[PDB]
Amino acid sequence: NYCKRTPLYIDFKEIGWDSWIIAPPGYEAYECRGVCNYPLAEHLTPTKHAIIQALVHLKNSQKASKACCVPTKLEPISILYLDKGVVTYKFKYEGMAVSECGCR
Amino acid sequence: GNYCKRTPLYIDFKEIGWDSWIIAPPGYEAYECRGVCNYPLAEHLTPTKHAIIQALVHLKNSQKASKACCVPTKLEPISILYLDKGVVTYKFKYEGMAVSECGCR
Amino acid sequence: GSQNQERLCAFKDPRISHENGTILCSKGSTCYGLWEKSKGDINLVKQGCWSHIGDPQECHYEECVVTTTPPSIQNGTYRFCCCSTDLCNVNFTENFPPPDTTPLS
Amino acid sequence: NQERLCAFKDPYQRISHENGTILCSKGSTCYGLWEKSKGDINLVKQGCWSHIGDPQECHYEECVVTTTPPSIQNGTYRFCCCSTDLCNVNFTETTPLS
Numbered sequence: 353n354y355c356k357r358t359p360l361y362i363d364f365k366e367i368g369w370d371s372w373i374i375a376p377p378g379y380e381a382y383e384c385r386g387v388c389n390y391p392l393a394e395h396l397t398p399t400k401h402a403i404i405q406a407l408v409h410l411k412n413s414q415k416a417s418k419a420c421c422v423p424t425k426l427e428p429i430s431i432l433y434l435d436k437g438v439v440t441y442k443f444k445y446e447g448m449a450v451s452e453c454g455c456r
Numbered sequence: 457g458n459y460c461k462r463t464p465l466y467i468d469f470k471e472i473g474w475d476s477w478i479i480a481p482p483g484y485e486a487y488e489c490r491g492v493c494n495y496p497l498a499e500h501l502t503p504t505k506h507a508i509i510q511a512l513v514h515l516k517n518s519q520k521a522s523k524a525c526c527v528p529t530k531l532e533p534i535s536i537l538y539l540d541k542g543v544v545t546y547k548f549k550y551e552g553m554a555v556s557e558c559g560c561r
Numbered sequence: 562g563s564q565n566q567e568r569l570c571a572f573k574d575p576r577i578s579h580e581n582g583t584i585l586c587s588k589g590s591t592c593y594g595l596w597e598k599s600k601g602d603i604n605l606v607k608q609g610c611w612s613h614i615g616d617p618q619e620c621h622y623e624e625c626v627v628t629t630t631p632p633s634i635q636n637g638t639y640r641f642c643c644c645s646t647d648l649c650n651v652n653f654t655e656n657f658p659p660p661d662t663t664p665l666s
Numbered sequence: 667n668q669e670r671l672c673a674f675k676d677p678y679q680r681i682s683h684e685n686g687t688i689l690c691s692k693g694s695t696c697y698g699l700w701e702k703s704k705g706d707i708n709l710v711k712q713g714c715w716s717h718i719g720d721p722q723e724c725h726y727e728e729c730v731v732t733t734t735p736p737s738i739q740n741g742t743y744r745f746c747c748c749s750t751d752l753c754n755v756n757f758t759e760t761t762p763l764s
């Protein structure tokens with residue numbers, strides 16, 4: 353169960369946001385699931401802090417928590433949304449979809 | 457509440473066995489990020505658009521998505537003297553070592 | 562083409578130019594249109610490229626087909642579709658579900 | 667905040683090579699690193715030490731080796747840091763009352 357990117361489909365109608373987002377209907381946002389255990393693999397781009405905290409947790413679980421599996425790179429999607437009756441197109445609406453997961 | 461925030465964490469290199477290669481300092485205040493990320497995610501936690509959306513999905517269906525995680529969002533360097541293949545190596549600004557800011561990701 | 566992930570789309574939204582009512586959509590971007598429709602009244606609002614990132618479901622149609630029930634906003638008049646063949650976004654068709662069956666109808 | 671003048675030594679590196687000094691940025695302390703090996707004390711490095719890291723090792727006015735030397739190379743290294751101009755040129759390591 354190591355830290356990795358797993359699927360997550362967002363339906364804007366289900367979350368109640370197609371009051372303002374009118375396209376797309378939804379998208380593949382993904383998420384990051386799984387555990388970060390020392391040693392932290394290089395593909396999880398660990399920070400020096402994450403590696404140190406992970407090692408402290410292994411030595412003494414009461415002194416520090418595990419490093420956390422989180423998005424480390426996000427990507428833009430296209431969107432149409434309404435801002436007080438004005439339609440706004442954005443080809444690149446940043447921060448919406450996970451491309452990489454890591455340990456932080 | 458126990459909301460996401462920076463909390464104390466002292467690193468003693470002898471305790472983790474890194475005194476073998478780190479000459480100085482003997483340890484330092486690394487800090488850590490602890491606590492929960494609750495929707496709506498507070499502005500000071502600098503949430504990403506993805507974190508906001510994931511947090512909302514988790515509230516509706518905790519099986520579909522995990523809570524947003526409290527993690528370091530800005531790290532600061534320390535000065536260090538260490539052995540790099542037996543060579544004594546100085547870095548004034550060894551990056552990524554100490555937490556200055558925590559957020560929800 | 563298919564090898565280079567480029568397609569030509571209709572364009573309306575007064576590196577890549579958009580002369581003579583078309584635009585090139587690269588990196589696997591689909592074509593999209595947005596209309597607003599009320600009975601026999603139809604207005605084209607916008608047309609152009611839709612990023613592949615997030616791989617939205619209905620952009621897999623070869624033709625521009627509205628398959629999700631329109632948003633309630635603006636009296637349910639919006640018609641968005643996106644599609645994966647050249648100039649597919651010149652026109653749209655509707656194929657969206659009817660409201661579900663409840664004990665009250 | 668103060669800009670320390672510090673002793674400077676690093677064969678593998680503003681700096682006065684003529685005076686063997688470095689003018690450090692605001693907040694930074696002076697440091698020195700020696701190695702006590704085979705009955706010899708040898709200078710390894712000297713220069714600037716960042717304030718960042720909650721470093722209590724560096725509040726002393728004089729360069730004093732306070733903590734039991736690191737395990738590295740059989741406890742031969744001698745590190746100190748200090749908060750006065752040129753404090754890192756030298757280091758120090760029954761009670762005086764009996």
